[PDB]
Design an enzyme around this catalytic site. Structure first.
Site, PDB file in Angstrom:
ATOM      1  N   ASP B  25     -36.106  30.884 -13.663  1.00 55.29           N
ATOM      2  CA  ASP B  25     -36.852  32.093 -14.014  1.00 55.29           C
ATOM      3  C   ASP B  25     -36.364  32.689 -15.078  1.00 55.29           C
ATOM      4  O   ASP B  25     -35.280  33.596 -15.369  1.00 55.29           O
ATOM      5  CB  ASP B  25     -36.828  33.250 -12.929  1.00 55.29           C
ATOM      6  CG  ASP B  25     -37.818  34.388 -12.878  1.00 55.29           C
ATOM      7  OD1 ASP B  25     -38.343  34.309 -14.021  1.00 55.29           O
ATOM      8  OD2 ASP B  25     -37.772  34.975 -11.958  1.00 55.29           O
ATOM      9  N   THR B  26     -36.832  32.357 -16.319  1.00 60.76           N
ATOM     10  CA  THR B  26     -36.572  33.175 -17.535  1.00 60.76           C
ATOM     11  C   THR B  26     -36.732  34.569 -17.601  1.00 60.76           C
ATOM     12  O   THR B  26     -36.065  35.124 -18.648  1.00 60.76           O
ATOM     13  CB  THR B  26     -37.294  32.425 -18.723  1.00 60.76           C
ATOM     14  OG1 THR B  26     -38.698  32.355 -18.854  1.00 60.76           O
ATOM     15  CG2 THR B  26     -36.991  30.886 -19.020  1.00 60.76           C
ATOM     16  N   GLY B  27     -37.685  35.219 -16.854  1.00 59.95           N
ATOM     17  CA  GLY B  27     -37.758  36.662 -16.709  1.00 59.95           C
ATOM     18  C   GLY B  27     -36.929  37.107 -15.966  1.00 59.95           C
ATOM     19  O   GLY B  27     -36.813  38.457 -15.608  1.00 59.95           O
TER      20      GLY B  27
HETATM   21  C1  MJD Z   1     -39.936  37.367  -8.252  1.00 61.52           C
HETATM   22  C2  MJD Z   1     -40.547  36.343  -9.058  1.00 61.52           C
HETATM   23  C3  MJD Z   1     -41.135  35.478  -8.331  1.00 61.52           C
HETATM   24  C4  MJD Z   1     -42.042  36.836  -9.864  1.00 61.52           C
HETATM   25  N1  MJD Z   1     -41.712  37.829 -10.699  1.00 61.52           N
HETATM   26  C5  MJD Z   1     -41.429  37.419 -12.003  1.00 61.52           C
HETATM   27  C6  MJD Z   1     -39.918  37.465 -12.509  1.00 61.52           C
HETATM   28  O1  MJD Z   1     -39.936  36.556 -13.499  1.00 61.52           O
HETATM   29  C7  MJD Z   1     -39.612  38.933 -12.676  1.00 61.52           C
HETATM   30  C8  MJD Z   1     -40.175  39.600 -13.768  1.00 61.52           C
HETATM   31  C9  MJD Z   1     -39.706  41.112 -14.083  1.00 61.52           C
HETATM   32  C10 MJD Z   1     -40.454  41.976 -13.555  1.00 61.52           C
HETATM   33  C11 MJD Z   1     -39.999  43.245 -13.491  1.00 61.52           C
HETATM   34  F1  MJD Z   1     -40.579  44.364 -12.690  1.00 61.52           F
HETATM   35  C12 MJD Z   1     -39.216  43.555 -14.227  1.00 61.52           C
HETATM   36  C13 MJD Z   1     -38.364  42.577 -15.096  1.00 61.52           C
HETATM   37  F2  MJD Z   1     -37.490  43.178 -15.886  1.00 61.52           F
HETATM   38  C14 MJD Z   1     -38.716  41.332 -14.998  1.00 61.52           C
HETATM   39  N2  MJD Z   1     -38.353  39.283 -12.648  1.00 61.52           N
HETATM   40  C15 MJD Z   1     -37.542  40.107 -11.531  1.00 61.52           C
HETATM   41  O2  MJD Z   1     -37.889  40.438 -10.535  1.00 61.52           O
HETATM   42  O3  MJD Z   1     -36.292  40.190 -11.878  1.00 61.52           O
HETATM   43  C16 MJD Z   1     -35.415  41.328 -11.843  1.00 61.52           C
HETATM   44  C17 MJD Z   1     -34.411  41.258 -10.868  1.00 61.52           C
HETATM   45  C18 MJD Z   1     -33.633  39.896 -11.691  1.00 61.52           C
HETATM   46  O4  MJD Z   1     -32.548  40.403 -12.408  1.00 61.52           O
HETATM   47  C19 MJD Z   1     -32.845  41.350 -13.189  1.00 61.52           C
HETATM   48  O5  MJD Z   1     -33.840  40.889 -14.078  1.00 61.52           O
HETATM   49  C20 MJD Z   1     -34.948  41.430 -14.191  1.00 61.52           C
HETATM   50  C21 MJD Z   1     -35.052  42.150 -12.773  1.00 61.52           C
HETATM   51  C22 MJD Z   1     -33.427  42.515 -12.571  1.00 61.52           C
HETATM   52  C23 MJD Z   1     -33.409  42.189 -11.144  1.00 61.52           C
HETATM   53  S1  MJD Z   1     -42.997  38.831 -10.836  1.00 61.52           S
HETATM   54  O6  MJD Z   1     -42.644  39.873  -9.472  1.00 61.52           O
HETATM   55  O7  MJD Z   1     -42.684  40.030 -12.110  1.00 61.52           O
HETATM   56  C24 MJD Z   1     -44.487  38.239 -10.988  1.00 61.52           C
HETATM   57  C25 MJD Z   1     -44.949  37.903 -11.936  1.00 61.52           C
HETATM   58  C26 MJD Z   1     -46.350  37.508 -12.302  1.00 61.52           C
HETATM   59  C27 MJD Z   1     -46.590  37.415 -11.270  1.00 61.52           C
HETATM   60  N3  MJD Z   1     -47.870  36.562 -11.080  1.00 61.52           N
HETATM   61  C28 MJD Z   1     -48.299  36.299  -9.838  1.00 61.52           C
HETATM   62  N4  MJD Z   1     -49.152  35.870  -9.242  1.00 61.52           N
HETATM   63  C29 MJD Z   1     -49.829  35.685  -7.932  1.00 61.52           C
HETATM   64  C30 MJD Z   1     -48.955  34.489  -7.104  1.00 61.52           C
HETATM   65  C31 MJD Z   1     -49.941  36.836  -7.238  1.00 61.52           C
HETATM   66  O8  MJD Z   1     -47.259  37.032  -8.934  1.00 61.52           O
HETATM   67  C32 MJD Z   1     -46.186  37.347  -9.995  1.00 61.52           C
HETATM   68  C33 MJD Z   1     -45.197  38.036  -9.549  1.00 61.52           C
END
Ligand code: MJD
Lengths: 99, 99
Positions: B25-27
């Site tokens: 997860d690059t994000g």
């Molecule tokens: C949990 C993951 C499986 C999915 N996520 C992508 C993940 O890369 C997500 C991107 C992100 C969101 C955010 F609000 C703030 C950020 F700084 C970064 N990262 C994330 O939860 O990371 C958290 C945690 C990881 O360590 C630190 O870096 C960023 C913060 C912080 C706590 S998501 O919730 O943002 C996401 C994004 C796009 C999507 N598309 C869908 N589509 C369908 C399946 C509904 O679901 C999604 C869900």
């Protein structure tokens, strides 16, 4: 380009005539952008992530330039903390992970 | 390997003697795993994502094998919907984005 991951992989995007920064996010299935002004029709959607769910507006066949590369696809607009480029658009610009 | 993004970039990990799947997860800045049994001391933390915040346990200097590559670093354990390998560990296995 090749991008290493010592810093967040942020890129410049152009969408709906506006310049923004967004995170190249391999953990995102879909592309989610912070509240912005996009033209045309949209469908309500709720998506889930680490802390629960948000309501987004779904826009289809939206043109987006991502670091100089053009792609057309679905963009979700709503209360995400950061602009996320997800795999729906990363596949169109030929983006890969390598180790 | 090179990994394309037509499907979620899931890999096998070994951590605390247990085999799991996790998303490259690059994000994600940090690595977040679903509730599991890890030995030793930990510090309370709250982290934010798309839908709000979760409370996690922070474990430091944790050994993890990610697709055959060993890394040691911080792992957060808590109610994430999916196991996430974040940039803290992706940098250690030499992971890059390319387009
Ligand atoms: C949990 C993951 C499986 C999915 N996520 C992508 C993940 O890369 C997500 C991107 C992100 C969101 C955010 F609000 C703030 C950020 F700084 C970064 N990262 C994330 O939860 O990371 C958290 C945690 C990881 O360590 C630190 O870096 C960023 C913060 C912080 C706590 S998501 O919730 O943002 C996401 C994004 C796009 C999507 N598309 C869908 N589509 C369908 C399946 C509904 O679901 C999604 C869900």
């Amino acid at each position: 380009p090749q991008i290493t991951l010592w810093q967040r992989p942020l890129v410049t995007i152009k969408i709906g005539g506006q310049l923004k920064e967004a995170l190249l996010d391999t953990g995102a299935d879909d592309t989610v952008l912070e509240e912005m002004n996009l033209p045309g029709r949209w469908k309500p959607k709720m998506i889930g992530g680490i802390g629960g769910f948000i309501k987004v507006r779904q826009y289809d066949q939206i043109l987006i330039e991502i670091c100089g590369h053009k792609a057309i696809g679905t963009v979700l607009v709503g209360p995400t903390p950061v602009n996320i480029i997800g795999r729906n658009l990363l596949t169109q610009i030929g983006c890969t992970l390598n180790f």
